[PDB]
PDB file of C-alpha atoms in Angstrom:
ATOM      1  CA  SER A 439      90.296  59.917 101.798  1.00 52.43           C
ATOM      2  CA  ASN A 440      92.275  61.731  99.598  1.00 49.00           C
ATOM      3  CA  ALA A 441      93.504  65.479 100.873  1.00 47.84           C
ATOM      4  CA  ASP A 442      92.056  68.677  99.095  1.00 48.44           C
ATOM      5  CA  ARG A 443      94.130  69.483  96.158  1.00 48.06           C
ATOM      6  CA  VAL A 444      95.192  73.275  96.205  1.00 44.15           C
ATOM      7  CA  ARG A 445      96.933  75.177  93.299  1.00 44.05           C
ATOM      8  CA  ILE A 446      99.609  77.758  94.728  1.00 45.55           C
ATOM      9  CA  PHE A 447     100.934  80.428  91.978  1.00 41.60           C
ATOM     10  CA  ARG A 448     104.769  80.817  92.429  1.00 40.41           C
ATOM     11  CA  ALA A 449     106.477  83.485  90.826  1.00 39.10           C
ATOM     12  CA  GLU A 450     109.247  82.951  88.949  1.00 34.47           C
ATOM     13  CA  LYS A 451     112.371  83.002  91.187  1.00 38.86           C
ATOM     14  CA  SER A 452     114.279  85.399  89.300  1.00 37.27           C
ATOM     15  CA  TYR A 453     111.670  88.156  90.521  1.00 39.35           C
ATOM     16  CA  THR A 454     112.930  87.754  93.943  1.00 38.51           C
ATOM     17  CA  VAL A 455     113.627  90.710  96.159  1.00 41.60           C
ATOM     18  CA  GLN A 456     115.255  91.865  99.290  1.00 40.52           C
ATOM     19  CA  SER A 457     114.840  95.136  99.393  1.00 40.19           C
ATOM     20  CA  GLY A 458     112.317  98.012  98.254  1.00 38.09           C
ATOM     21  CA  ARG A 459     108.779  98.565  98.935  1.00 37.86           C
ATOM     22  CA  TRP A 460     106.124  96.334  96.950  1.00 38.63           C
ATOM     23  CA  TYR A 461     102.397  96.249  95.984  1.00 37.81           C
ATOM     24  CA  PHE A 462      99.998  93.618  94.338  1.00 38.73           C
ATOM     25  CA  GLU A 463      96.014  92.840  94.067  1.00 38.45           C
ATOM     26  CA  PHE A 464      94.036  89.524  94.565  1.00 36.65           C
ATOM     27  CA  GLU A 465      90.733  89.271  93.394  1.00 35.34           C
ATOM     28  CA  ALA A 466      88.616  86.915  95.118  1.00 39.03           C
ATOM     29  CA  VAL A 467      85.715  85.392  92.837  1.00 39.12           C
ATOM     30  CA  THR A 468      84.931  82.919  94.856  1.00 38.76           C
ATOM     31  CA  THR A 469      84.571  83.511  99.052  1.00 41.49           C
ATOM     32  CA  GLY A 470      86.276  79.719 100.293  1.00 41.08           C
ATOM     33  CA  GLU A 471      89.811  78.830 101.064  1.00 39.98           C
ATOM     34  CA  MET A 472      92.360  80.987  99.108  1.00 38.48           C
ATOM     35  CA  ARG A 473      95.208  82.806 100.552  1.00 40.45           C
ATOM     36  CA  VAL A 474      97.746  85.722  98.891  1.00 41.41           C
ATOM     37  CA  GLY A 475     100.446  87.595 100.232  1.00 44.99           C
ATOM     38  CA  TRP A 476     104.456  86.813 100.398  1.00 46.01           C
ATOM     39  CA  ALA A 477     106.245  83.719  99.690  1.00 47.45           C
ATOM     40  CA  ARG A 478     110.083  82.554 100.093  1.00 48.78           C
ATOM     41  CA  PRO A 479     111.566  81.402  96.781  1.00 52.97           C
ATOM     42  CA  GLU A 480     111.313  77.906  98.144  1.00 54.37           C
ATOM     43  CA  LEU A 481     108.376  76.256  99.387  1.00 53.37           C
ATOM     44  CA  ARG A 482     107.728  72.982 100.459  1.00 53.13           C
ATOM     45  CA  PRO A 483     104.827  70.500  98.739  1.00 52.05           C
ATOM     46  CA  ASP A 484     101.884  69.507 100.855  1.00 55.02           C
ATOM     47  CA  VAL A 485     102.177  71.960 103.157  1.00 55.33           C
ATOM     48  CA  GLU A 486      99.435  74.912 103.284  1.00 52.39           C
ATOM     49  CA  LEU A 487     101.008  78.709 102.794  1.00 48.79           C
ATOM     50  CA  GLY A 488     102.068  80.343 105.965  1.00 50.16           C
ATOM     51  CA  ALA A 489     101.829  76.868 107.594  1.00 52.53           C
ATOM     52  CA  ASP A 490     105.549  76.695 108.239  1.00 52.44           C
ATOM     53  CA  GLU A 491     108.293  79.602 108.115  1.00 55.20           C
ATOM     54  CA  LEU A 492     108.008  80.098 104.068  1.00 55.84           C
ATOM     55  CA  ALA A 493     105.287  82.366 103.589  1.00 53.58           C
ATOM     56  CA  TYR A 494     102.943  85.380 105.274  1.00 50.80           C
ATOM     57  CA  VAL A 495      99.746  85.399 103.777  1.00 46.20           C
ATOM     58  CA  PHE A 496      95.895  86.353 104.525  1.00 45.30           C
ATOM     59  CA  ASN A 497      93.172  83.853 104.367  1.00 46.24           C
ATOM     60  CA  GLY A 498      90.142  85.523 103.625  1.00 48.11           C
ATOM     61  CA  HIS A 499      87.763  82.872 103.812  1.00 44.89           C
ATOM     62  CA  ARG A 500      86.962  83.867 107.489  1.00 42.45           C
ATOM     63  CA  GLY A 501      89.732  86.140 107.894  1.00 43.67           C
ATOM     64  CA  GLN A 502      93.250  84.763 109.051  1.00 42.88           C
ATOM     65  CA  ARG A 503      97.075  85.591 108.951  1.00 43.60           C
ATOM     66  CA  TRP A 504      99.205  82.842 108.399  1.00 44.74           C
ATOM     67  CA  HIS A 505     102.557  82.643 109.340  1.00 42.74           C
ATOM     68  CA  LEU A 506     104.056  79.405 111.438  1.00 44.00           C
ATOM     69  CA  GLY A 507     100.040  78.885 111.796  1.00 46.60           C
ATOM     70  CA  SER A 508      97.101  80.797 111.711  1.00 45.38           C
ATOM     71  CA  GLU A 509      95.493  83.730 114.074  1.00 43.26           C
ATOM     72  CA  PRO A 510      92.298  85.740 113.520  1.00 43.73           C
ATOM     73  CA  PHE A 511      93.186  88.683 111.449  1.00 45.09           C
ATOM     74  CA  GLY A 512      90.949  91.535 109.390  1.00 48.38           C
ATOM     75  CA  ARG A 513      88.010  90.162 108.205  1.00 49.22           C
ATOM     76  CA  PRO A 514      86.317  87.642 105.491  1.00 55.39           C
ATOM     77  CA  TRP A 515      86.069  88.425 101.912  1.00 55.68           C
ATOM     78  CA  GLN A 516      82.993  88.655  99.517  1.00 57.09           C
ATOM     79  CA  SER A 517      82.648  88.060  95.830  1.00 59.15           C
ATOM     80  CA  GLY A 518      84.691  90.811  94.035  1.00 61.02           C
ATOM     81  CA  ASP A 519      86.705  92.091  96.684  1.00 58.57           C
ATOM     82  CA  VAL A 520      90.239  92.842  96.135  1.00 60.33           C
ATOM     83  CA  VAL A 521      93.288  92.255  98.667  1.00 60.84           C
ATOM     84  CA  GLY A 522      95.839  94.664  98.765  1.00 59.63           C
ATOM     85  CA  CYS A 523      98.998  93.073  99.495  1.00 58.73           C
ATOM     86  CA  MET A 524     101.952  95.328 100.813  1.00 57.73           C
ATOM     87  CA  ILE A 525     106.137  94.453 101.824  1.00 58.84           C
ATOM     88  CA  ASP A 526     108.340  96.858 103.125  1.00 58.80           C
ATOM     89  CA  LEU A 527     111.335  95.381 103.098  1.00 58.40           C
ATOM     90  CA  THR A 528     113.169  98.608 105.216  1.00 60.37           C
ATOM     91  CA  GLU A 529     110.785  98.863 108.304  1.00 57.64           C
ATOM     92  CA  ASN A 530     110.381  95.056 107.537  1.00 56.76           C
ATOM     93  CA  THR A 531     106.715  94.793 107.229  1.00 55.65           C
ATOM     94  CA  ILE A 532     103.375  93.431 105.856  1.00 54.12           C
ATOM     95  CA  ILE A 533     100.361  95.460 105.206  1.00 50.63           C
ATOM     96  CA  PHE A 534      97.056  93.814 103.800  1.00 46.93           C
ATOM     97  CA  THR A 535      94.361  96.234 102.032  1.00 48.33           C
ATOM     98  CA  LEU A 536      90.557  94.957 101.373  1.00 48.37           C
ATOM     99  CA  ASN A 537      89.029  97.250  99.073  1.00 50.42           C
ATOM    100  CA  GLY A 538      91.760 100.093  99.542  1.00 51.13           C
ATOM    101  CA  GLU A 539      90.832  99.950 103.574  1.00 52.42           C
ATOM    102  CA  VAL A 540      93.682  98.793 105.747  1.00 53.92           C
ATOM    103  CA  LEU A 541      93.164  95.236 107.444  1.00 54.84           C
ATOM    104  CA  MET A 542      94.117  95.724 111.197  1.00 53.36           C
ATOM    105  CA  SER A 543      94.846  93.317 113.513  1.00 52.16           C
ATOM    106  CA  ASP A 544      93.116  91.877 116.448  1.00 54.26           C
ATOM    107  CA  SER A 545      95.120  93.825 118.571  1.00 54.89           C
ATOM    108  CA  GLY A 546      94.741  97.180 116.581  1.00 57.42           C
ATOM    109  CA  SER A 547      97.525  97.444 114.323  1.00 58.13           C
ATOM    110  CA  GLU A 548      98.034  98.027 110.524  1.00 58.33           C
ATOM    111  CA  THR A 549     101.108  96.141 110.569  1.00 57.67           C
ATOM    112  CA  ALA A 550      99.941  92.317 109.601  1.00 55.62           C
ATOM    113  CA  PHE A 551     103.512  91.247 110.306  1.00 58.33           C
ATOM    114  CA  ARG A 552     106.595  92.937 111.450  1.00 62.92           C
ATOM    115  CA  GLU A 553     110.181  92.440 112.030  1.00 60.65           C
ATOM    116  CA  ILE A 554     110.268  90.253 109.290  1.00 60.28           C
ATOM    117  CA  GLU A 555     114.055  88.691 108.245  1.00 60.84           C
ATOM    118  CA  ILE A 556     114.825  89.842 104.582  1.00 64.42           C
ATOM    119  CA  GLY A 557     116.719  86.019 104.192  1.00 65.27           C
ATOM    120  CA  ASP A 558     116.673  84.828 100.736  1.00 65.58           C
ATOM    121  CA  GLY A 559     114.195  87.496  99.931  1.00 65.87           C
ATOM    122  CA  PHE A 560     110.240  87.411  98.860  1.00 63.60           C
ATOM    123  CA  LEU A 561     107.930  86.772  95.912  1.00 64.39           C
ATOM    124  CA  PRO A 562     103.668  86.995  95.321  1.00 61.76           C
ATOM    125  CA  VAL A 563     102.076  83.884  96.031  1.00 61.01           C
ATOM    126  CA  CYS A 564      98.468  82.581  96.242  1.00 60.69           C
ATOM    127  CA  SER A 565      96.919  79.398  96.664  1.00 59.43           C
ATOM    128  CA  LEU A 566      93.570  78.325  95.606  1.00 56.93           C
ATOM    129  CA  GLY A 567      91.798  75.451  97.007  1.00 57.85           C
ATOM    130  CA  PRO A 568      89.540  73.210  95.212  1.00 57.43           C
ATOM    131  CA  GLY A 569      86.498  74.947  93.142  1.00 56.13           C
ATOM    132  CA  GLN A 570      88.303  78.153  94.145  1.00 60.25           C
ATOM    133  CA  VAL A 571      88.363  80.968  91.889  1.00 62.65           C
ATOM    134  CA  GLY A 572      90.724  84.366  92.228  1.00 63.88           C
ATOM    135  CA  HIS A 573      92.950  86.715  90.206  1.00 63.05           C
ATOM    136  CA  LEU A 574      96.602  88.272  90.513  1.00 63.74           C
ATOM    137  CA  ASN A 575      97.292  91.401  89.500  1.00 67.12           C
ATOM    138  CA  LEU A 576     100.808  91.918  89.767  1.00 65.45           C
ATOM    139  CA  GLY A 577     100.428  95.571  88.318  1.00 62.23           C
ATOM    140  CA  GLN A 578     101.834  95.799  84.688  1.00 61.13           C
ATOM    141  CA  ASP A 579      99.195  97.715  84.123  1.00 62.18           C
ATOM    142  CA  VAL A 580      99.499 100.064  86.827  1.00 61.45           C
ATOM    143  CA  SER A 581      96.227 101.779  86.259  1.00 61.35           C
ATOM    144  CA  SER A 582      94.725  98.553  86.026  1.00 62.41           C
ATOM    145  CA  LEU A 583      95.129  97.894  90.019  1.00 60.24           C
ATOM    146  CA  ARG A 584      91.639  98.654  91.563  1.00 60.23           C
ATOM    147  CA  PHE A 585      92.799 100.167  94.754  1.00 60.26           C
ATOM    148  CA  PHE A 586      96.811 100.998  94.585  1.00 58.92           C
ATOM    149  CA  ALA A 587      95.867 104.572  94.032  1.00 58.62           C
ATOM    150  CA  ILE A 588      93.955 105.034  97.439  1.00 59.31           C
ATOM    151  CA  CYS A 589      96.191 102.998  99.627  1.00 55.20           C
ATOM    152  CA  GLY A 590      99.879 101.991  98.401  1.00 54.00           C
ATOM    153  CA  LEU A 591     100.790 104.675  95.667  1.00 54.71           C
ATOM    154  CA  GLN A 592     101.341 107.694  98.123  1.00 54.81           C
ATOM    155  CA  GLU A 593     102.962 105.585 100.956  1.00 56.02           C
ATOM    156  CA  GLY A 594     105.670 104.699  98.878  1.00 54.78           C
ATOM    157  CA  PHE A 595     104.802 101.501  97.683  1.00 54.90           C
ATOM    158  CA  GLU A 596     105.772 100.177  93.810  1.00 54.15           C
ATOM    159  CA  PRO A 597     103.963  97.945  91.690  1.00 56.29           C
ATOM    160  CA  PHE A 598     105.855  94.693  92.126  1.00 59.23           C
ATOM    161  CA  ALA A 599     105.784  93.972  88.153  1.00 57.30           C
ATOM    162  CA  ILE A 600     108.737  96.614  88.163  1.00 54.85           C
ATOM    163  CA  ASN A 601     111.059  93.427  88.943  1.00 54.12           C
ATOM    164  CA  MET A 602     109.403  91.138  86.201  1.00 51.40           C
ATOM    165  CA  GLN A 603     111.089  91.953  82.981  1.00 51.46           C
ATOM    166  CA  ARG A 604     109.795  90.258  79.659  1.00 48.61           C
ATOM    167  CA  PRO A 605     112.281  88.348  77.600  1.00 50.39           C
ATOM    168  CA  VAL A 606     113.025  89.395  74.421  1.00 51.09           C
ATOM    169  CA  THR A 607     114.208  88.281  70.909  1.00 49.15           C
ATOM    170  CA  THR A 608     116.256  91.438  69.251  1.00 47.48           C
ATOM    171  CA  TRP A 609     116.391  92.030  65.891  1.00 47.51           C
ATOM    172  CA  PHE A 610     119.057  94.461  64.980  1.00 46.27           C
ATOM    173  CA  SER A 611     119.561  96.592  61.445  1.00 46.58           C
ATOM    174  CA  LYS A 612     121.068  99.662  60.542  1.00 51.44           C
ATOM    175  CA  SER A 613     118.401 100.842  58.332  1.00 51.75           C
ATOM    176  CA  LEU A 614     117.354 103.857  58.771  1.00 53.93           C
ATOM    177  CA  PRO A 615     115.044 103.752  56.024  1.00 56.30           C
ATOM    178  CA  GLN A 616     112.980 100.965  58.557  1.00 54.63           C
ATOM    179  CA  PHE A 617     112.809 103.049  61.241  1.00 55.25           C
ATOM    180  CA  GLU A 618     111.794 106.013  58.867  1.00 55.20           C
TER     181      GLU A 618
END
């Protein structure tokens, strides 16, 4: 029996962060096997996110946090729900929200992961199992973030897209009349 095909959406490695406090969202359209969170710049093939050391993710199918394996955490997704992903590379913590409300661990903690090591740094990541549908928003248009202002903005987290600069081709001219 062939294994499930899982799509993994890496960010360009050149956007990797080793400092600061960053924020992005992920909308669950379906309600099944998807994961979202923060990845190392290297991922191994044919391994699910957070099964090993290379990612720290939330699985909202039933509510799990994944890093070196799974644990019960948060609560399950409904269609339309938006997961907020936060990483704090000064405090060294990861926090998830669901429709702007922090997802608490089973033990009662706001931090989903703590005492994380900066190492090679982090990138936003998601995985989509077969059939599944979900959209990242890395916050190019900050106002488009649905729950940032409710939890993340005042808390000092910045939209991750600030780390992403459009490549450009420039055309120079000395002609004032062209720039009126």
